[PDB]
Scaffold this active site. Sequence first.
Site, PDB file in Angstrom:
ATOM      1  N   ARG A 210      -3.785  28.620 -25.988  1.00 53.89           N
ATOM      2  CA  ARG A 210      -3.468  27.938 -24.777  1.00 53.89           C
ATOM      3  C   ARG A 210      -4.678  27.761 -23.908  1.00 53.89           C
ATOM      4  O   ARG A 210      -4.633  27.068 -22.937  1.00 53.89           O
ATOM      5  CB  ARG A 210      -2.375  28.651 -24.025  1.00 53.89           C
ATOM      6  CG  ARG A 210      -2.793  29.955 -23.442  1.00 53.89           C
ATOM      7  CD  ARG A 210      -1.722  30.566 -22.551  1.00 53.89           C
ATOM      8  NE  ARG A 210      -2.095  31.938 -22.297  1.00 53.89           N
ATOM      9  CZ  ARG A 210      -2.072  32.881 -23.210  1.00 53.89           C
ATOM     10  NH1 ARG A 210      -1.629  32.620 -24.425  1.00 53.89           N
ATOM     11  NH2 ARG A 210      -2.481  34.075 -22.909  1.00 53.89           N
TER      12      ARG A 210
ATOM     13  N   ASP B 197     -10.803  28.814 -20.059  1.00 50.49           N
ATOM     14  CA  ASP B 197      -9.936  29.842 -19.473  1.00 50.49           C
ATOM     15  C   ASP B 197      -9.266  29.213 -18.266  1.00 50.49           C
ATOM     16  O   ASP B 197      -9.936  28.862 -17.291  1.00 50.49           O
ATOM     17  CB  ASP B 197     -10.687  31.110 -19.067  1.00 50.49           C
ATOM     18  CG  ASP B 197      -9.731  32.270 -18.738  1.00 50.49           C
ATOM     19  OD1 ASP B 197      -8.501  32.017 -18.722  1.00 50.49           O
ATOM     20  OD2 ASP B 197     -10.192  33.423 -18.499  1.00 50.49           O
TER      21      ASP B 197
HETATM   22  C1  LIG Z   1     -11.258  21.907 -14.556  1.00 51.96           C
HETATM   23  C2  LIG Z   1     -11.550  23.197 -15.280  1.00 51.96           C
HETATM   24  C3  LIG Z   1     -11.898  24.291 -14.571  1.00 51.96           C
HETATM   25  C4  LIG Z   1     -12.186  25.468 -15.254  1.00 51.96           C
HETATM   26  C5  LIG Z   1     -12.121  25.501 -16.619  1.00 51.96           C
HETATM   27  C6  LIG Z   1     -12.444  26.748 -17.445  1.00 51.96           C
HETATM   28  O1  LIG Z   1     -12.141  26.831 -18.530  1.00 51.96           O
HETATM   29  N1  LIG Z   1     -13.213  27.792 -16.761  1.00 51.96           N
HETATM   30  C7  LIG Z   1     -13.606  28.952 -17.446  1.00 51.96           C
HETATM   31  C8  LIG Z   1     -13.524  30.147 -16.789  1.00 51.96           C
HETATM   32  C9  LIG Z   1     -13.947  31.293 -17.415  1.00 51.96           C
HETATM   33  C10 LIG Z   1     -14.418  31.249 -18.679  1.00 51.96           C
HETATM   34  C11 LIG Z   1     -14.510  30.061 -19.330  1.00 51.96           C
HETATM   35  C12 LIG Z   1     -15.041  30.056 -20.744  1.00 51.96           C
HETATM   36  F1  LIG Z   1     -15.967  30.975 -20.991  1.00 51.96           F
HETATM   37  F2  LIG Z   1     -14.007  30.372 -21.478  1.00 51.96           F
HETATM   38  F3  LIG Z   1     -15.560  28.910 -21.087  1.00 51.96           F
HETATM   39  C13 LIG Z   1     -14.083  28.872 -18.684  1.00 51.96           C
HETATM   40  C14 LIG Z   1     -11.792  24.398 -17.325  1.00 51.96           C
HETATM   41  C15 LIG Z   1     -11.510  23.246 -16.678  1.00 51.96           C
HETATM   42  N2  LIG Z   1     -11.195  22.112 -17.536  1.00 51.96           N
HETATM   43  C16 LIG Z   1      -9.818  21.731 -17.879  1.00 51.96           C
HETATM   44  N3  LIG Z   1      -8.846  22.418 -17.410  1.00 51.96           N
HETATM   45  C17 LIG Z   1      -7.617  22.120 -17.694  1.00 51.96           C
HETATM   46  C18 LIG Z   1      -6.531  22.964 -17.076  1.00 51.96           C
HETATM   47  C19 LIG Z   1      -5.222  22.696 -17.353  1.00 51.96           C
HETATM   48  C20 LIG Z   1      -4.293  23.478 -16.758  1.00 51.96           C
HETATM   49  C21 LIG Z   1      -4.724  24.490 -15.926  1.00 51.96           C
HETATM   50  N4  LIG Z   1      -5.979  24.707 -15.704  1.00 51.96           N
HETATM   51  C22 LIG Z   1      -6.886  23.992 -16.243  1.00 51.96           C
HETATM   52  N5  LIG Z   1      -7.268  21.122 -18.451  1.00 51.96           N
HETATM   53  C23 LIG Z   1      -8.194  20.353 -18.994  1.00 51.96           C
HETATM   54  C24 LIG Z   1      -9.499  20.624 -18.736  1.00 51.96           C
HETATM   55  C25 LIG Z   1     -10.213  19.675 -19.445  1.00 51.96           C
HETATM   56  N6  LIG Z   1      -9.349  18.905 -20.065  1.00 51.96           N
HETATM   57  N7  LIG Z   1      -8.153  19.312 -19.807  1.00 51.96           N
HETATM   58  C26 LIG Z   1      -6.983  18.703 -20.313  1.00 51.96           C
END
Ligand SMILES: Cc1ccc(C(=O)Nc2cccc(C(F)(F)F)c2)cc1Nc1nc(-c2cccnc2)nc2c1cnn2C
Length: 267
Positions: free
Chosen positions: A134, A148
């Site tokens: 997820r 995440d």
């Molecule tokens: C907008 C956004 C903001 C944050 C992150 C994210 O993954 N941050 C994160 C935090 C800690 C560690 C890591 C890791 F090491 F694992 F990389 C990442 C991803 C997205 N991007 C998106 N978020 C969501 C999303 C969907 C629902 C709830 N939250 C976020 N949906 C998306 C995207 C891009 N495409 N789509 C469909």
Amino acid sequence: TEIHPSCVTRQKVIGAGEFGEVYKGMLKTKEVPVAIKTLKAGYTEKQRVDFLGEAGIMGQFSHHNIIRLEGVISKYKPMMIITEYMENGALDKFLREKDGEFSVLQLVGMLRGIAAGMKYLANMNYVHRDLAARNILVNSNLVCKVSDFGLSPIRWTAPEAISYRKFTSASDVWSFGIVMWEVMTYGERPYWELSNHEVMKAINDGFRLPTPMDCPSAIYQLMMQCWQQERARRPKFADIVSILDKLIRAPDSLKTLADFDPRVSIR
Ligand SMILES: Cc1ccc(C(=O)Nc2cccc(C(F)(F)F)c2)cc1Nc1nc(-c2cccnc2)nc2c1cnn2C
């Protein structure tokens, strides 16, 4: 990278955040599609630290299988984290909506990708703690990017992290084993209807998830080794990436399937 608010337009709500909404939208630099995580007014000091900390670590990450940070808006409110948009969205939903449509080589390649992004995170000394399908996004090239969305899980968590909060890259390896099972099963719920407690007691009593249908013997052996109780006995993500890479590059190796434990239907 600092993005100006005038370069960002929000369209859809696609989820919820720590103290904000997640949007789809468009970013100017014609306009790249993007996902936008906001930090709404009245956020706390702690929330601000976690938000800009998250933005910073994402900005320092640069890897094919890690969600790419387009930019941040920190000088204007609401604060925003802007990533590439991943058309196919989260992997768990994606596989559940596409049951059986992929080859074993496509699936195992999605697993190599995830494991490569995880090896990168473990090497950068980042413990994910919430690795599950997820939290994995899929782009129109079938490329899996670890992400995440922070809604944190017991079923994907290692026993030491459950038992006493020992979250490490070895606990992420356990989660990765669960992710391997999610993928090879097209998004089945791990342990199916077992309650959280029943899942803990089955693990500690030594039960492990059975083989998916149509699963290469080597892939099941690998996830089984991710579920070693002794955390020091689990493969390192370098071992996982290596084994997956060799399987993919010698694809006949994936033709030997593990036995599937059935249920009766007779002529
Ligand atoms: C907008 C956004 C903001 C944050 C992150 C994210 O993954 N941050 C994160 C935090 C800690 C560690 C890591 C890791 F090491 F694992 F990389 C990442 C991803 C997205 N991007 C998106 N978020 C969501 C999303 C969907 C629902 C709830 N939250 C976020 N949906 C998306 C995207 C891009 N495409 N789509 C469909």
